[PDB]
Each structure stands twice: as structure tokens, then as C-alpha cells.
Design an enzyme around this catalytic site. Sequence first.
Site, mmCIF file in Angstrom:
data_model
loop_
_atom_site.group_PDB
_atom_site.id
_atom_site.type_symbol
_atom_site.label_atom_id
_atom_site.label_comp_id
_atom_site.label_asym_id
_atom_site.label_seq_id
_atom_site.Cartn_x
_atom_site.Cartn_y
_atom_site.Cartn_z
ATOM 1 N N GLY C 63 0.823 -1.196 0.000
ATOM 2 C CA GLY C 63 0.000 0.000 0.000
ATOM 3 C C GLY C 63 0.860 1.250 0.000
ATOM 4 O O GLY C 63 0.492 2.246 0.612
ATOM 5 N N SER C 65 1.628 3.685 -1.853
ATOM 6 C CA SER C 65 1.209 4.999 -2.322
ATOM 7 C C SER C 65 0.195 5.647 -1.379
ATOM 8 O O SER C 65 -0.109 6.829 -1.531
ATOM 9 C CB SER C 65 0.663 4.911 -3.723
ATOM 10 O OG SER C 65 1.693 4.538 -4.631
ATOM 11 N N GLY C 66 -0.328 4.879 -0.412
ATOM 12 C CA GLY C 66 -1.260 5.408 0.576
ATOM 13 C C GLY C 66 -0.604 6.431 1.504
ATOM 14 O O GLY C 66 0.620 6.461 1.640
ATOM 15 N N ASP C 67 -1.436 7.252 2.158
ATOM 16 C CA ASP C 67 -0.968 8.354 2.984
ATOM 17 C C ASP C 67 -0.061 7.836 4.108
ATOM 18 O O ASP C 67 1.040 8.352 4.311
ATOM 19 C CB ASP C 67 -2.143 9.178 3.535
ATOM 20 C CG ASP C 67 -2.906 10.014 2.511
ATOM 21 O OD1 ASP C 67 -2.497 10.040 1.326
ATOM 22 O OD2 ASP C 67 -3.907 10.646 2.909
ATOM 23 N N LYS C 70 3.567 6.729 2.732
ATOM 24 C CA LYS C 70 4.437 7.732 2.143
ATOM 25 C C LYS C 70 4.748 8.840 3.149
ATOM 26 O O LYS C 70 5.848 9.387 3.124
ATOM 27 C CB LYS C 70 3.827 8.296 0.854
ATOM 28 C CG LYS C 70 2.675 9.282 1.011
ATOM 29 C CD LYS C 70 2.163 9.810 -0.322
ATOM 30 C CE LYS C 70 0.913 10.662 -0.192
ATOM 31 N NZ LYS C 70 0.540 11.314 -1.468
ATOM 32 N N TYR C 236 2.426 5.109 18.988
ATOM 33 C CA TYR C 236 2.685 6.106 20.017
ATOM 34 C C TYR C 236 3.442 5.526 21.214
ATOM 35 O O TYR C 236 3.831 6.284 22.103
ATOM 36 C CB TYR C 236 1.383 6.787 20.463
ATOM 37 C CG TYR C 236 0.607 7.390 19.303
ATOM 38 C CD1 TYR C 236 1.030 8.564 18.690
ATOM 39 C CD2 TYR C 236 -0.518 6.750 18.786
ATOM 40 C CE1 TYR C 236 0.343 9.098 17.609
ATOM 41 C CE2 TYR C 236 -1.208 7.272 17.701
ATOM 42 C CZ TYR C 236 -0.775 8.449 17.112
ATOM 43 O OH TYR C 236 -1.444 8.961 16.039
ATOM 44 N N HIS C 297 -3.686 2.330 23.363
ATOM 45 C CA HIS C 297 -2.446 2.986 23.783
ATOM 46 C C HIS C 297 -2.324 3.054 25.315
ATOM 47 O O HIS C 297 -1.377 2.514 25.897
ATOM 48 C CB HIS C 297 -2.300 4.345 23.084
ATOM 49 C CG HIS C 297 -1.023 5.053 23.383
ATOM 50 N ND1 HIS C 297 0.217 4.493 23.177
ATOM 51 C CD2 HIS C 297 -0.792 6.266 23.883
ATOM 52 C CE1 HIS C 297 1.152 5.350 23.543
ATOM 53 N NE2 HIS C 297 0.566 6.432 23.969
ATOM 54 N N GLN C 425 5.572 13.294 26.744
ATOM 55 C CA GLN C 425 5.227 14.425 25.900
ATOM 56 C C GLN C 425 4.827 15.593 26.790
ATOM 57 O O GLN C 425 4.168 15.371 27.804
ATOM 58 C CB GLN C 425 4.058 14.087 24.968
ATOM 59 C CG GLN C 425 4.409 13.099 23.864
ATOM 60 C CD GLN C 425 5.344 13.679 22.832
ATOM 61 O OE1 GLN C 425 5.360 14.883 22.607
ATOM 62 N NE2 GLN C 425 6.108 12.820 22.173
ATOM 63 N N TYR C 431 10.651 11.854 37.265
ATOM 64 C CA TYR C 431 11.113 12.385 38.535
ATOM 65 C C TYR C 431 10.250 11.856 39.673
ATOM 66 O O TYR C 431 9.128 11.409 39.441
ATOM 67 C CB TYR C 431 11.150 13.912 38.399
ATOM 68 C CG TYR C 431 9.842 14.579 38.002
ATOM 69 C CD1 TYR C 431 8.874 14.884 38.951
ATOM 70 C CD2 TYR C 431 9.575 14.893 36.674
ATOM 71 C CE1 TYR C 431 7.676 15.482 38.585
ATOM 72 C CE2 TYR C 431 8.389 15.502 36.296
ATOM 73 C CZ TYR C 431 7.433 15.791 37.255
ATOM 74 O OH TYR C 431 6.258 16.376 36.881
#
Lengths: 526, 527, 527
Positions: C63, C65-67, C70, C236, C297, C425, C431
Site C-alpha cells: 500500500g 502509495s497510501g498516505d 508515504k 505512540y 495505547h 510528551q 522524577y
Amino acid sequence: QDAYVADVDGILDVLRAQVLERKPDIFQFISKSALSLQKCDRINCKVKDEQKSRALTIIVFGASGDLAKKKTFPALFDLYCGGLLPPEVNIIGYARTKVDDVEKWKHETLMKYFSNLSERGCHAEDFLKHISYFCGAYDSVDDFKRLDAVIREKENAFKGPEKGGNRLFYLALPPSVFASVCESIHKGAMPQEVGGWVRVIIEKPFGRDTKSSAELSQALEPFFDESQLYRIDHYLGKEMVQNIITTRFANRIFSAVWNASNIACVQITFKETIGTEGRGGYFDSIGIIRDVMQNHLTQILALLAMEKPRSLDAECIRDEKVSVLKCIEPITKENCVLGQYTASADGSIPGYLEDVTVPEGSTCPTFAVMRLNINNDRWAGVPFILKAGKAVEQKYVAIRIQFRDEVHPYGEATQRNELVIRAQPSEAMYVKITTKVPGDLRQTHQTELDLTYRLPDAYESLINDALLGNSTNFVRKDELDVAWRIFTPLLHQIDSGEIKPIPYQAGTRGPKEADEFIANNGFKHQ
Amino acid sequence: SHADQDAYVADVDGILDVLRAQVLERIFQFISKSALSLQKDDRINCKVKDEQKSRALTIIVFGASGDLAKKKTFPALFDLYCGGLLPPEVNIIGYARTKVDDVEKWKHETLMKYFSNLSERGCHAEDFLKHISYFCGAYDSVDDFKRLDAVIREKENAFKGPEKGGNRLFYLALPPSVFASVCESIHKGAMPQEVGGWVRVIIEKPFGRDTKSSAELSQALEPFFDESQLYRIDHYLGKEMVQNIITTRFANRIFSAVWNASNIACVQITFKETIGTEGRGGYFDSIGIIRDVMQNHLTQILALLAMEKPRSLDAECIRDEKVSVLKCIEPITKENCVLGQYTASADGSIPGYLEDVTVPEGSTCPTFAVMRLNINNDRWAGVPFILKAGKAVEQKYVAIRIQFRDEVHPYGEATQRNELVIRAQPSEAMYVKITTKVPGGDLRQTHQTELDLTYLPDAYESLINDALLGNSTNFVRKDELDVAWRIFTPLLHQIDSGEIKPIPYQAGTRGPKEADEFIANNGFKHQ
Amino acid sequence: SHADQDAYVADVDGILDVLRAQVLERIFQFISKSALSLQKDDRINCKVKDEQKSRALTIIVFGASGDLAKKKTFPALFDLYCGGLLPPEVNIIGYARTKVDDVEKWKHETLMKYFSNLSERGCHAEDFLKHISYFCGAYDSVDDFKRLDAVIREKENAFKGPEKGGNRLFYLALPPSVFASVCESIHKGAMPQEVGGWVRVIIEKPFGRDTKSSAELSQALEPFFDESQLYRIDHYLGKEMVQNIITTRFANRIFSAVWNASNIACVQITFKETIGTEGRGGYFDSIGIIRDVMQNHLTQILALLAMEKPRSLDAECIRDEKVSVLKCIEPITKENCVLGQYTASADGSIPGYLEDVTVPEGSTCPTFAVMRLNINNDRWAGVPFILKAGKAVEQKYVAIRIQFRDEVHPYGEATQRNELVIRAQPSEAMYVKITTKVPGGDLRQTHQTELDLTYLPDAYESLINDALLGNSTNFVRKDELDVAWRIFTPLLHQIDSGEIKPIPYQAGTRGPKEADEFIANNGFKHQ
């Protein structure tokens, strides 16, 4: 070998996980899990001298059917490997479909379902040599005469002392063709006059109510009597029946408590995780009560509840099965909770109604709890609970006898004793009692006493029993009649819609109302 | 009928429970009103209790230099210490007549020699001695006990804990002839302070030698100490066996329902030692095997085993039950008793009973006894109960064996008598023998199997512990003791009057062959 | 008691170690025999491994060429290249349906646009493209995969190194609806050569949307690829946070001993973004915040944080532990869940969730969720675990916060709750907050101090790396996935059935005021 450092570590990893789950008080638990983690041979013939003295022929009608090829033939194979078939045994698969290559049929239809065990698989080819295919009708006398000749052939060639031959006919068929097969055998292929017995194993259902069952028994009795007729129930193991009979009747301790004045309730439970598995259409005609409760569970009840037999001879045991069943009142709708499974959470078991072969609006129960009342001196007022369920939380068959509590003097420092006889998912038999813990007497522990000291499996045990002519674990004609009279009014009420199944999710225990029913009919959880 | 007796008791108990359930919400006359209306329908880890470490405690071992105290009592207290069952502020005072100078050398040379050498306890010996004092006095001077009282208060007021006063266990490691005066002495001025503290008194056997002698002692002590305070101790009755007897039966319907005439064929309680008496005719010859362990030790075991159901596990309820069943026992007859006296072992290593300077030549004193008791009640009538005790026999054994009636039908010789065994010596063991199926397939192919019903201070130690905890269960109560003596005294008289005679048996044998014939002739069948 | 559980595990592990120490000198039956007997007592610097550069490797990005592929997968492989963690002979094949003519213009216009422009990597872009091929095919034709197989063997036999065959990572940057056919396709004829080579398959979320849907996919894939081969990826979950969770705790007695009910007051795992969903109701509205990041996640983070001690750092041991603890979690209840949906920011710069063409008008879909989980085991019973996820809130944050119980005595208000924070993040930080003395001089003069426990490819990149290295730790196993779905599905049903409803909150706020009330009502105290 850096793959010896690996595999032992995995072994340890499994032991670790066992002990951390069970949490024993650890060396001895590791010891007895190492040995449970282990747990081209010639067949030594364990057969009696009467069994080797005459030819034996086993004829399986419906040989290419699912029952015969997935269950009967593999069973006979296991018995062969276990030395429980005579050395010159002849087995014939009789079916209606023509076959070009019988040898292909043997490989493709039967061998495919033989246990792929190392110590079994290397006998398969030797076993097939004892098997023939026979193509015929189930209702044409001439076909049974042609069968008779094929058999006489093998019999008259027997390399052994007595003449003639013993014939076991296994009717792996719908009940609708039994009368015609039996008549055909009567006229066409009974054993030679010179010598040999005829036995006939027939499969459930044995009717679907008193009337239909009696009709079927009248249709067979002119051809075979109750010494010849073997109504098989696949689930009733030899090992559980010895548990029920010996533990009790050989012992003062268990004999003396096996009655109304010491027992609070008795529950006989049949649980599977599988659903109907696409074959809902067939099951929808039968329902859970006819499927396993009126037959299998009731035979268990009979054996558990019977008075003492005049001897340990088969027909004496059967007389007592009959007598106690005769004391049971017909089950009322009020003493019955029904269930019907819906889809499992992971969808591995589609809901009973999702099956396209189940008709819309089906009310067929896949689950049932009920209470039976045995009206005799031994049992009056003792609730007997039968429970059977498909698509519930585990695979399990057991008898649980719960004894009356001793309120005084231990009070809450004790609880009801139990005797448990389990057959599935493995055999166990044990008593729960309270014992002292090693100052106060009030400090107590519930403990389990194991009473239980490759044997054949339950089904194989019954076929062996039929070969030796032991009727014990087979429902006799009169016994059967009485069993139908226990259940038939309830089945009528259910078929008239007076009880409705409660939906339960597959994988759960069943409807909450079934557990409440058990707790309301003499069972305490603790 | 057997089921109806038990049912009658269970009904009565159930009625009392619903009275209890009502009369615990807002008087005798409420019983009668509710009655009519119910009809219409390493380091010592401290294991001690909160109350225990909440007030001060002084254990006074009187006669502290005597053999019993130094070789048994103090080593037993030492083990309780090591096992973390003495309160941490525990005061212990050995009292005795000899005046002593170096108190610390007494603790070491008279006491420590006899402590446990085992390495798990070696460490603690010196620790335990910090808790011990010495006191020199007589057993009759009111003066000395006022002096003791002051010494105790000294240690008591020094206690660093909430409740005032102090609990006092008086241990009379003394000859019984002095029990009365020591007890009067403690009454006159060494009882616990008025503010608080229980008093308890452990007294040691013999508790007389017959009905008359035993009741004199009871009358002698009872002016000063009641049955909630007096603790007549039996060194050999262990917690572990008592619980096996009571729990296994009374907590369980299975055993409870079979514990009767209708199910039990015969019952034997056995106490057997390989040791003889050599050099102790000094005590034994006057006492004999019957008074030594049978009247006192075996009979309490019997009482616990045969008693009816107590309404609760409260100690005095259990004791009430011991008394009632003992009252149902017929006085043992000379027709139901076989006696033995041991001679030298065949091998000639153990000398005979009469071969001892401290034994009257020609003594007729039994070192062995087997006897049949009849318990005349609904539960036990007709059931043989056999008590057996013997010195210098083949093995060291102590066990109850219950033999149940055969189920002849329908297994016949493919089954046999179930049994239940509760063993305490040479080690603890409790099992039932039953008949099971064997796998692989005739119904009559059966095995015998022994089920193990099994799931630490020794017997003596655990009795001292129970007394500290204020638990009377395994101690013979005054009424109980009297009845037991009435069961044995007439036989003991017929024995002293020569009406039956001991049979000789070589040390190391089972005993007299006649004893085994006796047993087998009293309902027991060999397995 | 908490100390005894850990001690029991440590004992068992110690016994297994001495078995291991013996059974590594010359069979199951040696375990049992030893058991009884133990009782009686700039330029890319290549960092790759030897095995890695020892056999050929083809990464096939299906796949291509899919977002996703690429814009994410290929740029991620590019970074691994730049960081010297791709083998130097690495073959990479983008597979896709569109037929292409100028392969080199595809690499530049479809792939290179999205590579990292940063000057430390700019240099390497053209280098990395030499390793990439294009392949045009469908996802179901057995033909195309036989064609691919031939192309792979071409590149594999050309490898200039010792071992024959070639390792193959199949990356399905595809919609899940095609996973089953592509997998069957690879089974039928594009598996690695018989001579040698592992096969591994990376599959992309969503992994169903409930228990039923997820198990269908698992049953669909499991005929072709087992759990040593399948790699369900979570973009993630980063190495750096996973190690902070496992090492900090399990390598250290100090943290290990406090990681329990007896010491921890409450635990929150937080995932917060300022970004909304604008123009992506196309995916989001069907999924919601709970299925998007919480079921998958946050729950893996929870599992790693709450699991019992694994016997080793072997990946499947850790995964066994993730499964066991997940099995102890009660299905989340609607009584323990507060939902939000965002509206336009006060300032009016960010448009509300419903203000979007690609979002069903009137949608009830949560962009925010706070929930309490109960972990019913010895270690965690009674301890509040709070999961929080929200889009379009005040800050971009991802952290674990563990709040320990106060020591009230004897510092009182001169101390407060210790905490441990593991943040990923907007940047990595770990700590503990503790209370220290200040110099210059009363004992109650105290300060709060944060101890820094801290001593590179991004999260996504390091997962691709682990899969190349054959490390399953941070990938959800089949059984694990099922249990997680069973924890969330009943709540998700009650949500779809409308039984609880989202509260509106303006984009840029913390979220619904009720959520903070919920948190504070579930054991957390503000510092």
C-alpha cells in the site's frame, strides 16, 4: 546447544506460572507438575478365552456417516490397539452408497479420523485389513442375505475352536430405519444355528416422548430382546459408575449418609462450551432436555439414587434403576428454568438464532435447570437438580452431593460437606470436610480428600461392555418407559409455550434465574 | 431412630437459636412468651493476644528446684518463649525452700542445663533468663507469701502498659500433700490486686488414687479456688489430638452421622511404651498402670470421643459433655479386665519389673492392662470400648482406632470394615480406611485405601498455653474427676484384694496372649 | 503481607534458579527428584547486529502509495537508515496497485517530498532511495505474489554475505479489510525460502472496534501467521517510556517494594492534545476517543505499569505478565466514566467538533474521556487507576503520575504525598517528588524537591526497529488484545446505547469541570 538453555527455561517458565496461580504452601507442587508435564509396540491381546474361542463380526450400519466415521470407527480402532478386540476380528462398514475403491474409502473416510497418536497411528494399516466395505439397503432382506454370506465366509474360515460366529450390529443410523434394519437382520443375517450370539447397539434419540418411545420399543421387541438390545448413551463412563456404586455400597461410612437425613441436595451437571455449530436445525427438533437430560443425566440419577442391588449382576443393577425411577414424580414447569444462548462476546459462537437452519421465533432451550422429587423413604424432600447447558463457561460433568450442615457447635467455622464425582474435564472424586488447622478449635480449614486411586474412554468402555455382554450402563426397555413418564408432561408444557427460555450470553454460566433456582432449592454457595 | 436422636438435639438447638435471635432485641418471661408463639406456625515472633500483652503477668513456679520443675516446667516455658507465646513483659519466679546466693548461677546450673540445646533455641536461652527471678520461702508461712506479694507488685507496677494490676498463674510443681496449704497461703495474701488480674493455679498429678482420696483433695482446695481457676494438668493430652477428635467429628455431617451404635463395631484407645519402670518402683508400684495413665489420660480421651454434641465450643460446655458421658459408663468389672506384669526381655537386655531394688519383692502391680468399658446410652449401648495401656511392650504408640460395621451386602469379601485412626505417637496421623474401585473392569475389583484427613509446642507446652489463655477444655474438672474415679475405683479395689492377678509377659512382646484373645473376643476383627 | 507476596514470588524464582543450576549439568523427572531433595535441608555509522548483516533482508511496504506509507512509514525507515540501524544490503519494496513507468520519479514525488529535510539527513536522501524498488500488484492474486517472490529471490541470491535465503518483514500499510487476503497470499507463495529466513508481518490499527470485531480479524490471520510473527503496531508507544516503566521499577528494590496497594494512593495515565479532529470526522466519529487511544495505547501502558514481576526480560515473559494483569481488571462501568465533546474555542479560532462537514450533525461521539479502572488483585485492590484522554484541550501532555500515600506522622503539614511522574510528551522526563530538610535549624523546616531519575529514533521508528530485531515486548499479543477489548466493550456498548452522554467543553480548556471533580473524588489530592 544454546537451544538446551532455552527449552528448559520455558519448562521452568511454565512451572513458575503454575505455582503462582495455585500458590501452594512448593517443592512438592513443582514435583507433581513436572510429572503431569510428562504424564512401534506390539499389541498384547487382553481378551478373554471365550472371546478368542469364536469368530467375531462387527457390522456398523451408516459407516460413511458422521457418527460412524468420526466416533464409532475411531473407538473400535482404540479398542484394537488396546488389545480389547479378538485377534481375528471382522469389521464391516455397511452403507448405501457405491464405492469404486474400498481401500481409498478406508483411508479417506475412516483413517483420517483415527487418533494421530504415535503409539496408535502405527497400527492403522493393520486395522484397515480387518475392515471391509459393504453396499446395501437398510430394508431389503436379500441385501442382508448377501451380507450374511459375506460374513459366513469369514466365520467359516476362523482359525479357532468353536464354529459359527458372534455378531455385533451397530446401528449408527436415524431411529426411523431401526425397525427395518432389525427385521432385515432377523430374516437375513442372524448368526449361524451352530453357534454365536446376536447383539444390536442402537443410538438415540429413543423417541421423543412416552408414546413415540414405547412405539419404537414395540417395533423392535419381536426381533431382539433385552439381552440382545443395547441402547447406547455415549457419555456414561465405566469409571464414574464404579465411583457411584463402590464408594457408596462397599463402605459403611458412605452408605450411612446416603439418604434424606444427611443430604441437603444433589446436583447432576452437564456443561459444554460448544454451541450447536451450524446444526441448529437438527437440535431445534430435540432441545436440551431430550438431548442429554431424559437419557444421560437420568441414568446417572438412577444409579446414584437406587436402593442396594440384590447383587452386582447387571440386571440386578438395572432392576434398581427401574425401581427408583418409578418413585420420581413428573417434573412440573414450576421446577424448570430454560435458557437460549446468544452470541459469545468474541463471536466465536454465533447466537442460536443467528443460525440460518434455525427457524425464526424458535423457543428451543439450549439450557435447562430443573428439580426432581424422588418420593421414597431414602429421598423424600431431597431436591435432585439436573442441569445441562450448551455454550456455557466450561466443559464439565459432575455429581455434587451436598450434606446437611452441622450448625452446632462450629457455627460459621464449618460449612456443608460435599462429595463430588467429576468425569469432565477429567476424572476426580473427593469429599470436602472441615479439619483443624495446625490454639482455638474455631480455627478451621476446608480441605479436599482425593478418594480416586491409557485406559479406554467412556464410549469405548460401552462398546467393550457390549462385546463382553455387560448390560449395566445401558437403558433397559422398562427403565426407558419410566424415564419418559418423568419428562413428557414437562415437554408438553414446553411445546405449548408455557415456559419461555431466558436468553443468556454464550460463554457465561447461563441465566441468573437458573442459579437463583438452585439456591432456592436447597443449595448453599459458601 | 439414631437419626431422630440427633434430629431432636438439632431441633432443640434450632429453637434455642430463634429464641436467641429474638431475645437479642430487647428476661426469663420473654422466653416463655416466645416459646408459645414459636409453637404456633532466628527471632521470636510475638504471636500473643492483645489482652495478653495488655496487663502484667507473673508465672510463679513453686518447688522450682524439684525435678519436675527444672527438667520439665521451665524448659516448657522456655519453648513457649521461643515460640513467641509468652507476653513480652513476662515475669517468672521460681519459688523454693533452699536459700540461694548467686541467683544467676542457679538459673544456669539448675535450670539452663535442661533447656533445649537445639540451635533454633540455643540463641534464646540467655534472653529467657532475664525474665526469671528466684524467691526463697516455705509453703505454709503467711509471712513469706506477703513477702512474695510485695515482690510481685514491684514487678507489676513496673509494667509499661495500659491496664493496672497483674495476672497471676501459680504453678504448683509440688507433691500433692502441700497443695492445700500453698493454696490457703495464696488466698490469705498473694492473690492478684483488687484493681485487676485473674488468678489461676496449675496442680499436678496424682489427683488422689481413688474416689475417696481424690475427693478429699477437691474439698481441700475448693474453699480457696473454684473451677474457673483450678487447672488439673495431664502432661500427655495434646491440642492436636483433641482437635482431631472434636473438629473432625462435630464440624462434619459425614463423621457425625456415623459416630454411634448403629455404625461402629468397636473402639480401642491404646497407650503403649517400650520403656519400663526401672528404678522408679518408688512411684510406680503404689500407682500401677491403671491409675498412672488409664483413669486420667485414656479416660479424658474417651470422654472427648464419646461425648454428646455441645451447643458451642465454649470450654465449660465441652466439659459439661465430658461429665454427662462419663456418668453413662458402668464401673469397670474384674470380668472385663486383663492385667499384665513384665519380666526380663528374651534378649535379656531389659530387666523384669520385680528385678529392681525399689520394687517390693513379690509385687503384684500391673504394668499392663486391657479392659472393656460399657457406655449405657442411646448412642453407645452395646458398643465395645477397649482401653489398653502397657509398659515395656513392642512399640511406642498412642492411637484411637474406630472400627465400623461391615457392609456385607453386596460386595462381600471384596470389601471389609472401614476404620478411622487418630494417632498421636510416635507421630501425628489421622486416616480412614475405605474400599475403592481400581481402574482397568469388574465392579468387585477393589482396593483398600487410607485417606489422610490431616491438613509447634508439644502436648505439655500447649496445656500451659491453654491455661495462660484461660481455656479449660483439656483439663479435668472437679465433677469430671469424681465420676472417672467412680468408674475405676471398684475395679482397683478388687485388684488390691487379689481377686484378679497379672499375667507375666516378657518385656518387648505385645503383652499377655490372653489380652489379644480378650480384644478379639470383644468385637474387633483383624484386617 | 504485601512483603510476603513479593517474598513468595522471589522464593519460587530462587527455587527455579537452583533447579536451573543443577539441571544444567546432565528431563522432567530430574525436576521432581531435585524438588524433594532441595526440600530436605555526516556519515551513517552502522550500529546493526552481526546476525542482522549476516543474511539478506527485504522490507515490503504494501500500500506504498497510501498516505500512511508515504507520509509515515517510508520517512520512518529513512530515519532508521540515517541512524545506521538498517542492514547495509537492505532491500525495500513499495507494493501498490497503480502501474508506474518512471520508478525514480515516484521515489522523488510520492516518497521524497515527505522525508526529513533536516540538514543532518538531507545528505542521505538519495542514498536511501537506491535501496527502494517499486512493484505493482493486487492484494489477492496468487499470481502477483509468485511474481513478487521471484523479484525478492533475485535481490536475495544477489546478497554478498554468508547465510543463504533472506529475512522478510511484510508491512501492511493497508486498511484492515484486506489483511486476511494479503496474508493468505503471502502464505501461498511469498514466504521466505526453505533454506532460511524469518517472516514477520506488521499490521496497522484499528484492530477491530470491539471484542467481536477484533476476534474475527485474529481468527482470520491466525491460520497464516502465529504470534511470534504477527506485530500489531501502536505508533505512540516509545521505547524510552517502556524502559522507564520496567527498569526503574523492576531493577530497583526501592521502587519495587512501594509499587502496590499498601503504598500507592492513586495512579493516572494521561494523553492530552491541543489539536482537534477538524476534517477527520471521516475516521474519528465512528471510533471515538476511547477506541482511538485508550483501549489500545493507554491500556498497554497500564499493563506494563501494573504487571506482576516477569521471571526474565524475554519478550513473551513480559507479555504473559501484561495478559495476567489485564485479566484482573473489571470491565469499566458507565458509573466510572465521564465523557466530553469539544465545541469552538472561546477565542473562536478552533471550530467545534460538530462544526465539520465530515461529522454527522448531532453526533454524540466523545473527544474526551476520564475513567476509573479497578484492578482486583493482591497488589492493586482498592487502588484508583484513572485513565484520561482528550482532544483539543489546554496542553500536549502524555504522562504517568503515581501518587503515594502521605506519611501524616510525624511531619504533618511539613510533608506531603510523594509522587513519581513518567512523562513522554511534550518531552521525556521522569522524577520523584519527595520532602527534604533545608540547611540553616528546625526539623520541620522542609522543602519539596523533584529528583530527576533520567540518565535517537522516535516512538514509531523504534517499534519498526524492535520488529526488525524480533522483539515483541511493545506489541499487543492476540490474547492480550482480546482481554483489553473485554475490559472496554461493555462500556462502549452502553455509550452507543446512549446510557451516558458527553459534556460540552470549549476547545482549549482542560475539559469538562465534572472530569476534575471525578478525579479528585477518586483518591487524587492536588499538590
